[PDB]
Symmetry: C2
Subunit: 309 residues, 2 copies
């Protein structure tokens, strides 16, 4: 029984072996014995010269196409020697080369995660798959260096399995609204081939910031005979949350209504105006507690102090 080897993907006409050598035959000996390949299966991948006895490749030999994930990859055929009517079994092993990179089944993974997601939360990652075999197949995964997420991997029989992205440090949309990461999947060839997956994490807002007034206290001095409806003051509060969570409206806290009833606070603009006459007497000052509310139940406070001159 005769066994040869050849790497996949050689150029057509690449040398595989000499039948005459391995039968110990010369030129005249070889021809008189009338050798030829019996056509079957993939035998047409090889060409036998009946004068010299050389066996060469005849066409593209792709181990991935022939054998996929099976090992080893052997092409079998008979050589017929017409003289003695004897069949000679030939085996050629097709050697895997590293001509495939680990592939993901998508290019970009889009994730949405609340900024309040608890550390330890685990998300399973798309698998990398390498068409090569053995050392040339998938050997490892790598997640790009970053402060919030790390990679976890189960070390299985033939390689790594079930990659997961695990949250380590808390997210914060007010610091980073989006995170971009890269997952690579590498084989064990030399050099190593690495496939790539882009990961996009969108951080979903939580109402986790109260508004904040520009000042703890707003002082205003107003004329004794100021007309009704006069703008006295504009207050303002900012809020870093998103949408309704960061949208603030203004109002009086309900404390002493007999004071606050003399005034008007625009819920949207924060403009404070007098609604009723103000006395220089009876009340030198007029302290009032005000409130800034966002759209989802967080609040801030300030004091307004109106002095009549």
């Amino acid at each position: 029984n005769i066994r040869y080897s050849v790497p996949e993907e050689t150029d057509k006409g690449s040398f595989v072996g000499s039948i005459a050598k391995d039968l110990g035959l010369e030129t005249r000996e070889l021809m008189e014995r009338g050798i030829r390949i019996v056509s079957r299966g993939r035998s047409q991948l090889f060409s036998l010269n009946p004068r010299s006895g050389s066996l060469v490749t005849a066409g593209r030999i792709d181990r991935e196409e022939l054998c996929a994930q099976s090992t080893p990859c052997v092409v079998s055929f008979n050589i017929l020697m017409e003289d003695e009517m004897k069949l000679l079994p030939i085996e050629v092993e097709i050697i895997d080369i590293n001509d495939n990179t680990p592939q993901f089944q998508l290019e970009e993974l889009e994730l949405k995660m609340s900024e309040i997601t608890t550390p330890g939360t685990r998300i399973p990652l798309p698998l990398g798959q390498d068409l090569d075999v053995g050392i040339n197949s998938l050997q490892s995964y790598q997640l790009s260096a970053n402060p919030h997420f790390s990679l976890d991997v189960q070390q299985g029989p033939e390689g790594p399995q079930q990659p997961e992205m695990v949250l380590q440090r808390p997210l914060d949309r007010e610091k980073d609204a989006v995170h971009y990461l890269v997952l690579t999947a590498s084989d064990g060839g030399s050099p190593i081939h690495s496939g790539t997956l882009q990961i996009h994490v969108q951080v979903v807002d939580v109402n986790d910031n109260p508004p904040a007034f520009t000042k703890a206290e707003y002082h205003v001095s107003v004329p004794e005979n100021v007309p009704l409806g006069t703008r006295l003051l504009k207050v303002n509060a900012t809020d870093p949350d998103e949408g309704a969570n960061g949208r603030v409206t203004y109002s009086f806290h309900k404390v002493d209504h007999s004071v606050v009833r003399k005034f008007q606070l625009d819920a949207y603009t924060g403009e404070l105006s007098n609604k009723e006459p103000l006395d220089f007497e009876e009340y030198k000052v007029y302290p009032m507690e005000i409130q800034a509310q966002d759209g989802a139940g967080l609040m801030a406070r300030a004091k307004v102090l109106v002095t009549v001159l």
Copy 2:
């Protein structure tokens, strides 16, 4: 100068004092010199008998109406003795009684607070006001027992000032969506009068719970010749948050698409069905990672394991 006292709110005709007694005059004496009140200001609150010399009340005497918050409350007038044409100055002090309860300027305070509100957060409360004076006016505030809120009060000169409600234990809308409390404002009378304010705290939802599947693993065994479109399994996840925060949808995690592509998972109902033929050989089992997402970026995981018989 002659000084008498009388409590406010006595019945008409109540005794205040005897002018004859304090002038040391008898019947014939008193009459001959011809006494009478000189009408001015609040003198009509009193009636003088010109024969007996008694001074009594003539109508309702309300100290709040006469003197409000000022102290003391004295009604002054002259008595004319027509004989000597001499003016006699009389003072009657009106004694405060505790006939007013501390009042709030509203019946119910409605507050909205996120369940994520930071403990230590302070809210100023409506003021109580008592029309009486001294010991009979506002002396203290009380907040009904509750584990989430305490009352803070400033002890000022004449009474308690600036009551505040302070958050102590974190809120949790999934435990209590609302809290009802009572603020009382009391005077120092005997017995004490107490005014009452109802407080209604509405707890605003935060997405602070992920969904949770009914099981960590769903196993199903299916016949080799199961028709395409067969309902195989219904998964379910619950979520205690409110509205969108608790509304869950179902999907496959992106792991091995070559497996998951053979199936269909309804995003709303959680019904899993087969979409492509299943192989008894190519895949004995079919493990799949599934996901439940709420409407605001939290998620839970489970596994589905499909075996072909």
